[PDB]
Amino acid sequence: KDFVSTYQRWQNNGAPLGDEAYHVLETLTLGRLPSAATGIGNMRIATAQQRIGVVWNTEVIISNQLVYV
């Protein structure tokens, strides 16, 4: 389902080379280019004490891959 969505998006985009392409690449498990970020594909949801820890502590955010704004 996620594969179908990202494939359709990559295709009507014109089949360019980018994160749309790289996610499909990693999905077919034959290559990877990890970017220095954390996208929608993997975001654990933090606890309340995690909120009190961050409130603005960026190191815990990058430690536990939480929701960032």
């Binding site: 949801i45 933090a46 309340a48 995690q50 909120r51 961050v54 603005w56 955010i61 939480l66 929701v67 960032y68 704004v69």
Partner: peptide, 27 residues
Amino acid sequence: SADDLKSRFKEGSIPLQTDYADLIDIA
């Protein structure tokens, strides 16, 4: 309220499952 929900989503904030529950409850 709507403005409350905007308040819970300002820059620098991190939401919790209650925010999402309220969002889906708005239907």
